[PDB]
Every structure is written in structure tokens, then in C-alpha cells.
Amino acid sequence: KIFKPEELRQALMPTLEALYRQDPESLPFRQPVDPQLLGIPDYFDIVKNPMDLSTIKRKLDTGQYQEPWQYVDDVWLMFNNAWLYNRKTSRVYKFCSKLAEVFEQEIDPVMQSL
Numbered sequence: 001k002i003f004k005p006e007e008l009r010q011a012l013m014p015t016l017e018a019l020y021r022q023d024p025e026s027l028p029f030r031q032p033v034d035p036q037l038l039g040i041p042d043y044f045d046i047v048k049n050p051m052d053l054s055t056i057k058r059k060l061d062t063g064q065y066q067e068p069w070q071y072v073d074d075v076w077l078m079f080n081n082a083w084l085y086n087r088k089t090s091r092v093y094k095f096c097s098k099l100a101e102v103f104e105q106e107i108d109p110v111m112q113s114l
């Protein structure tokens with residue numbers, strides 16, 4: 001099945017909207033991690049392929065995803081990076097987990113019906 005970008009946007013955008021609707025949980029994920037601003041010079045030692053909601057949104061908006069799995073991969077990349085870098089005791093890690101739960105719940109029926 002070849003998907004039109006507009007069909008992908010239509011189908012997938014609500015799952016991204018669900019992530020943004022999580023407040024305050026999505027707030028650390030809405031822009032790329034800035035290690036200079038945050039004083040964390042080892043961030044890019046640990047995280048080689050950064051990802052965040054703004055990047056995912058731009059890619060969906062501009063039709064960069066050919067297939068739904070590619071979107072799903074970038075969402076999980078974002079989550080995996082945050083789980084890798086941050087300690088499980090941290091607020092950011094727990095918020096990562098909350099967003100991943102919401103994502104799993106929302107993406108499931110969407111993938112089925114694609």
C-alpha cells in the first residue's frame with residue numbers, strides 16, 4: 001500500500017495532537033534538547049540522533065513520512081533518547097513514560113485501520 005502524504009497526515013496527526021495535549025508532561029519534549037542552555041555538555045555524547053515533537057510535527061506537516069512505521073519510529077526515538085539520558089528518578093523520565101502510554105493507546109487503532 002502506497003499512502004498519500006495527506007492521508008498519512010490525516011490519520012496520524014491526531015496521535016501527535018494527543019501527545020501535545022498532555023500538559024505539563026509534553027513540555028520538555030516540545031523543542032529540541034539544548035545542551036548549552038541546560039548546562040549538560042554530555043548530552044550529545046549519549047544521544048546521537050536527537051528527536052522531539054517539533055521535529056516530528058514538521059516532518060508530518062511537510063509530508064516526509066512515506067509509510068506510517070516511519071512516524072512511529074521517530075516517536076519511539078524521542079522516547080528512547082529521554083529514557084537513556086535521564087535517570088528513572090527524574091520528572092522528565094516519568095513524563096516520558098506517561099507520553100509513551102498515551103501514544104501506545106492512540107496509535108494502536110490507527111495502525112490497525114491503516
Ligand SMILES: COc1ccc(N2C(=O)CCC[C@H]2c2nc3cc(-c4c(C)noc4C)ccc3n2[C@@H]2CCN(S(C)(=O)=O)C2)cc1Cl
Nearest residue numbers: 024025027028029031033034037081082085086091092095
Ligand atoms: C514540564 O516538565 C518539566 C519542567 C522543567 C523541568 N526542569 C527542571 O525541573 C529543572 C530545571 C531544568 C528543567 C528541564 N529539564 C529538562 C530536560 C530535558 C531533557 C529531555 C526531554 N531529554 O533529556 C533532557 C535533558 C528537556 C527539557 C528540560 N527542562 C526545561 C523544560 C523546558 N525547557 S526549554 C526552555 O529548553 O524548552 C527546559 C523538568 C520537567 Cl519534567
